[PDB]
Amino acid sequence: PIVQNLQGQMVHQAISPRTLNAWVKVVEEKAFSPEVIPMFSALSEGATPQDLNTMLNTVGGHQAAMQMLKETINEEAAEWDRLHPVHAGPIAPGQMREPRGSDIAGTTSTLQEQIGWMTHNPPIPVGEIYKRWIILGLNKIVRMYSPTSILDIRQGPKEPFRDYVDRFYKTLRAEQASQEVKNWMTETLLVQNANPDCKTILKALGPGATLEEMMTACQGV
- Asked whether the beta carbons of 175 and 146 are under 8 A apart, the reply is yes
What is the smallest separation between the CB atom of 97 and a copy of itself, expressed in angstroms?
Answer: 21
Burial class (CB in 10 A: 0-12, 13-18, 19+), 42: exposed
Nearer to a copy of itself, 93 or 146 (CB): 146
Question: Is the bond preceding 122 in cis, omega lying within 30 degrees of 0?
Answer: yes
Where along the sequence are the contacts to a copy of itself (CB under 8 A)? 1, 3-7, 9, 11-15, 17-22, 30, 33-35, 38-39, 41-43, 45-46, 54, 57-64, 66-68, 71, 140, 144, 147, 162, 165-166, 168-170, 172-173, 210-212, 215-216, 219
What is the smallest separation between the CB atom of 115 and a copy of itself, expressed in angstroms?
Answer: 10
- In the chain, what is the straight-line distance between the N-terminal and C-terminal CA atoms, in Å? 54
Residue whose C-alpha is closest to residue 153's, from 178, 190, 207: 190
What is the smallest separation between the CB atom of 124 and a copy of itself, expressed in angstroms?
Answer: 15
What is the smallest separation between the CB atom of 162 and a copy of itself, expressed in angstroms?
Answer: 6
Nearer to a copy of itself, 96 or 144 (CB): 144
Nearer to a copy of itself, 17 or 89 (CB): 17
Nearer to a copy of itself, 64 or 151 (CB): 64
The helix/strand/coil state of 3 is: strand
Q: Which amino acid is at 48?
A: T
Cα separation, 152 vs 17, in Å, equals: 42
